[model samples]
Target: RPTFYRQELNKTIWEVPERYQNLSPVGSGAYGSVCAAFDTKTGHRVAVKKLSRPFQSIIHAKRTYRELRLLKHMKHENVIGLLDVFTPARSLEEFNDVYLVTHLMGADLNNIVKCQKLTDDHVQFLIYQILRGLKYIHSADIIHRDLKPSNLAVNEDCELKILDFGLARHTDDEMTGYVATRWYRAPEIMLNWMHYNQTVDIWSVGCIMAELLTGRTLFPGTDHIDQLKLILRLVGTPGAELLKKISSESARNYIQSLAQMPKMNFANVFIGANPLAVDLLEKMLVLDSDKRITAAQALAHAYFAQYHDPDDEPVADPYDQSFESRDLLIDEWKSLTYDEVISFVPPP
Candidate 1:
């Protein structure tokens, strides 16, 4: 028989293993509600996210499966590794929710950036870790479509780890026009390019770096159209060669018709910053995704030379995405997710 118990916190009921205690609300969103708890058995603090109405529809079920499967496959120091998964339901017929557990951190980068002043060293190590995690993720042929500051978590020791994989997809997966937040999205995506790749993540890396240096969002756009305009304003209009690759004729003509703009000086934007840092940022944020700096390449750039360690940047085996291609019914996805939750074994 199963050995889980139930407790109520903040008007929500949590059914978890007996080992977990002190459940307190961390945050809540459309996806689920999160609570911080301590595992008496392992003596580790953890964040438990209870997925909201996971099987309500095929879309929701599919997303839950993708996030759970991807998180379980990813194992890197800078990537948030899934610690445990659970559901109070004893049978598939009763399973209605899922709980995901991960190591709890003190604060996300968004909160830290607002409250604390990050030094040059802090920015360097932070970016280095993000790229390191990205290198591992990309090696597995997976794209973390979303890479904003809020998704990056950090502790008092400045150890940064990336969370949230709901939008992450394998390279073999079909590309979606809308993935990342508007401000962090690459121009190619905004223009509805024919196809996108891992380089989109590099574009976001550039955005995050700029935000850290300037203490503000570099490209704060109010809407979709404004997002592209804001980017072109800084990076200047795309060359005809790159513009020729646009998936839509209207999008191409829109860029061609815009007044030609010259690229802004990097030093002017990130004032008093190291030339090497600005140089890397310029390469990463290029309008041409083909020319954007890759995660591995960015790590090896002169900007990170002081902190880069080739030996420590290990790659991962490509993840199996066969399940994603299947058009499984909602119940099938539920059973798969349920099995995943019960398959965990704590260390002795």
Candidate 2:
């Protein structure tokens, strides 16, 4: 059996219930943890995420509610499926945090990139999957602020799914500088401009596509200035005339200096890459956000068409010994009081 942790609400460890016979830690993040477990009743596998704590404020509580509500409404193959949720019985005050259950996927894009060198075909497939996911989310008016490789998951069938909607928000109203991750962020967001739309996600898809093809990030900049420099190097820097329309001072300064910046042709850098691939990259990395290709349009691009396979084989699942019998949970501990909770702490 796998040992589970028992600590305070802030540090509480996850325990697999007895109904689940085989469990293993699958993935983790700063805010939550996920475990893969087999459902003994259904004889199927699923992933479970335990949220850190119930919100201390109503605003946060609403956000949490929104995520669940959105997941309940949106269903797409490229979007992670919300299977179930577990909340403590009224008596177990200590077990206040909510637990979310979802489908167990193969591996995140980051994991795949680490082990395999991606071909142009692989890149095209991934971009298509991402766009399909984005199309679903956008139809619902949800903006996934954080769209990066780490937030994307691939199931055993090689199907892509978008995960971690924690940073997502409804796009019904005006939104300001809730900046996404620096490297994949849109030019407008980096410059602190507002009124951006779902197009931000398309920009991120471009970055991920670039990283996959090259086996390295196209612009893994360390700072704001460095990020712009990276962008300038790929697409020509913006001109002084264009700088006037730029909203942010930093962006204006960067644009004004485009005349002196050295030019780089990404065409030469990726000489061996397919021309169609480079063409897609060019459309995606446009200096003007408005000029950048849309996710739907990119799906129709020749690059994706070249690699399109209507009958690709599904991915296979890999079984491991580490997953054995880790899912059994003590019934009493499943509904434990603060003091009882401590007793259920599985030894590290």
Candidate 3:
């Protein structure tokens, strides 16, 4: 069987497998560019992402390894599945590229939210699936670290799948501040608190929920400082107790120096919104990470009562994160990635 090898494009080159056909460009970002194609072997549409210089540096190489490992281990209806992974390079020396294949969804939540007039029912169901996926991800002891509207893929049926696992890490692993988008970033992270947890994702979910309800970004901050101001402007200023928890001396002092602002009424902010939805929003948008409602708890909240299905809300066994902690050379990473791609056997 011949791999498609490499195809030249206007800006770059694609080295996808020949098994996938009808390749058309979909989207491109800092990390990779995606192409939609038909899998001749599986008789299904798939999206292939060509990682940009996967071995450019230790950071980039490690990220490529992390994403591949994370996606390979994850299996959930609301989470994107890794159909296949390959590279045109047949040997280790030429393994400069990595291509990942996944199911093709019509669009991401970002595009849908822009033009679609979503109803309350749509919002409820959408949020339910997000939480459902988080429940499973959290169960696996993995924090999505990055959860944004653009990262959520959707189809005509409104079925959602969380995408992009490059930032996800095990619960016990140490994390960096530069992870999630500023708007969706948890206050704890912005403040550089002593320790942050999966609740960071819950804050992101809350930000997304607010955007969905209003058809606009709740906090359109220009910078990180402005992001904090925007959040405080709406959620209101936190008290000294909360400020004291922040580990950053400058961040703590900055908040303490500000005027105390009262919390905004969700009813006023989200006019004519369902009271239950408002209640859940308040619980999720807590200034204190310790008080933020978890994915599991949010599932049980009254807002998701109609669609909450515990039986179907599957949880995963804790993911083994030992692989990530290993310090490997670029060549070693290349070998490991090559092994993974060649060893993979596509499902029937």
Candidate 4:
């Protein structure tokens, strides 16, 4: 029922079970390669990610296990979850690759941000879903280490789905947790702070929001060091109190050596955006993460008032998709995951 033929990216040669058809390349990134295919049985077009030797290294192994375990346990409408998972291997002897099946999205915000067709209303809706998903994720103690425009999946219907997410922290010197894109990266993430939280994601959302309003990124730094310069130019250097809390000596010294600057007015940066919208953006892009606006708080902001409706609010996992709740000898694949087990996190 499977063919041992490798396709694009030179990563793997997957036969991809006869059950899925219409296979074609979508794109590739930190994960291996992906293809858009039709699930023959369900009659649904889905995106499949082919992870090449996920257990090959500690970094690859940990991220792979986190994605798989994290995806299976979630059932939120805003947060992307696995529709199905498969491996062409019949047993431990043959198990060397992993494939994940998820709902196919029309496009990513990366593509949308490049165009000018989106209106203020579209921007509002996109931010709403991003925070909505973060609200769900934070409730479970997960920080989406990588939050960028490209990671946000969307449809013409205005539904936003978080994709290819990985939660990270500086577990040690070896784990600096720079999994995120440079432009939308939070200040804490850039400094490789000792500890960061969901607010890091909030900072990313702020950067993305600014891009939507101005049709360009808020801070398009050329590199990590240059990125800090751009940040201080706009956000200003951290105050003495903030600098003391900065855990990385190198990060603190780097900030101190730079000429001090004052924070810019979000209202002025996004001159034409709604005052309330800019106000919300200001709250999220703080140099001091502890004071940064949270996902739940952002959702309750005045900017989202017109977009928010108590009675019309969408709840999660209304109908359990069969694949989401399936019991498919999942344990068999644990070996390929390099024994990185994830425990069930309690509700917030």
Please report, in order, the local distance difference test score of every candidate based on alpha carbons. 0.82, 0.64, 0.81, 0.72
- lDDT of candidate 2 over 87-131, digit per residue (tens): 543345445566667767667988988787676667777888887
Question: What's each prediction's TM-score?
Answer: 0.91, 0.73, 0.89, 0.80
Q: Residues 1-348, candidate 4: write the lDDT tens digits.
A: 344444443454656778787688878865578888898767889888888667666555555766777777677778887677766666655566778788888888888788647788888899988888887777776778778887888887878988766545334443232323567878677656657677788888888888888887777765667777878777788888797787788777666787778898777778888888888887988888889988777788888876776554443433222333333334433463533222222223
lDDT of 1: 0.82
- What is candidate 1's CA lDDT for residue 191? 50
Query: 1 or 2, which is superior by lDDT?
Result: 1
lDDT of 1 by residue, 1-348 (tens): 447888887788888888888889988977789999998867899998998888888877888888888878878899988788878778888878788888888788998787899888889999999999999999998888778887899988999998775364333222333333567877776555646588888988899988888788887776667777889888888887777666677777677788989888988888898888889989988887888878888888988878899999999977888886899998888888888777865333
lDDT of 3: 0.81
Residue range with the least summed lDDT across 10 consecutive positions in model 4: 338-347
The TM-score leader among the candidates is: 1
RMSD in Å for model 1: 3.9
Candidate 3 clashing pairs, residues 3+ apart or interchain: 4-18
Encode model 3's per-residue lDDT on 1-348: one tens digit a residue.
465756765587887767888788888877789888999888989888988888887767777777887888788899988898877776887668788888888789998899899999999999999999999999988888778897899889998999875363323222333333556778777546545578889989999999999998877766667777878887889776776666677776777888889888889899999999999999999887887889998899988878987788999867788877799887777777778778877655
Per-candidate total of colliding backbone pairs: 0, 1, 1, 2
Better of 1 and 4 by lDDT: 1
